[PDB]
Amino acid sequence: DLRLHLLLNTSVTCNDGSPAGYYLKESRGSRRWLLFLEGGWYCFNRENCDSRYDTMRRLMSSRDWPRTRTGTGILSSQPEENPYWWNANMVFIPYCSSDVWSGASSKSEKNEYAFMGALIIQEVVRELLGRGLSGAKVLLLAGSSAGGTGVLLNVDRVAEQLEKLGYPAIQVRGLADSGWFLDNKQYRHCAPTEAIRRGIRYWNGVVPERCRRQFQEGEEWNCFFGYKVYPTLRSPVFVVQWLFDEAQLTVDNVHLPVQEGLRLYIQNLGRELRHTLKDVPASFAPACLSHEIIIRSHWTDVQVKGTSLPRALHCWDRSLHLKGCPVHLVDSCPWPHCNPSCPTG
Ligand SMILES: *[C@@H]1O[C@H](CO)[C@@H](O)[C@H](O)[C@H]1NC(C)=O
């Protein structure tokens, strides 16, 4: 029930030069806009991007995209499935740039692929202004997995873009789901830091300005790590992160009778994640082994300290205008599924 619109600026493209785009469901009465960034890993050289083109082509091209998509989870229009923002204008932005939403480079005689993630977001925002976004009160930039990291990389740029376009009244906020990773030691010895270092050069990747100025040339990969980029951001950002995220465990070379070394490794991972969220006032971090939450149909089921994620997001909304309406919800129990509300699989 979200309808595809390919970008009118056809110079803003997916990896293979096909036009990027977005799926839109408008809500006539609403001044709330939800723009969701899809995830799905990334690629960082010719060889691994070629492989992704063979077997994950929808993440590199719009040529085979369907005319519509069904909104699920926070993108559902039904209050039963989406207690939070069911009546909002909803936008799903397909991830077709393979660059963690950071790229600003075109396909050309020197570049086999285009990496335009950061420009896709900017162009979607610009084209939506003529479709009602100009009347918005709140724009929530949300995303899962690589899209969650994309929120952290792009939320302040969206805020700056709207300010420079003359829309200072639109309140830009971020919701980063499953995009808060640790550059930790692997359990056995890709290492995230090196691949992102390579990707930034391959993509012409861009990072938020204040973070860029802290880490400087050659070190901008640091800004892909939530606990380092988050303190530099000005827009309000709600962080959703499983304490034992499956993608984190994968990059850590953990594949699950757990003996002492792996037990301590997993417990330390949860402790470190919890530590990085200590001073993140709006966060939801259950002690579960899983990946992504906000566009899952059963996203309402998980609770931390008896509070669901849709409730926490509602409390966040109220805090940005609380007795029994918390926004900082981080599990303290130390092993996956010590929270009984964890997804079953
Ligand atoms: C199209 O997008 C490119 C890259 O973002 C930009 O340089 C150009 O000005 C845009 N043109 C139009 C007409 O939107």
Curated annotation (Swiss-Prot):
Record's keyword terms, sorted: Glycoprotein, Hydrolase, Phosphoprotein, Secreted, Serine esterase, Signal, Wnt signaling pathway
GO MF annotation, one: palmitoleyl hydrolase activity
Enzyme Commission code: 3.1.1.98
Active site: 145, 245, 291
Superkingdom, natural source: Eukaryota
Keyword Phosphoprotein assigned: yes
Tissue-wise expression: Rarely expressed in adult normal tissues.
Glycosylation sites: 9
Catalytic activity: [Wnt protein]-O-(9Z)-hexadecenoyl-L-serine + H2O = [Wnt protein]-L-serine + (9Z)-hexadecenoate + H(+)
A single Gene Ontology CC term: extracellular region
Any one Gene Ontology BP term: negative regulation of Wnt signaling pathway
Induction: Up-regulated in hepatocellular carcinoma (HCC) with high intracellular beta-catenin.
Family classification: Belongs to the pectinacetylesterase family. Notum subfamily.
Known function: Carboxylesterase that acts as a key negative regulator of the Wnt signaling pathway by specifically mediating depalmitoleoylation of WNT proteins. Serine palmitoleoylation of WNT proteins is required for efficient binding to frizzled receptors.
This protein's name: Palmitoleoyl-protein carboxylesterase NOTUM
Species in which this protein is naturally found: Homo sapiens
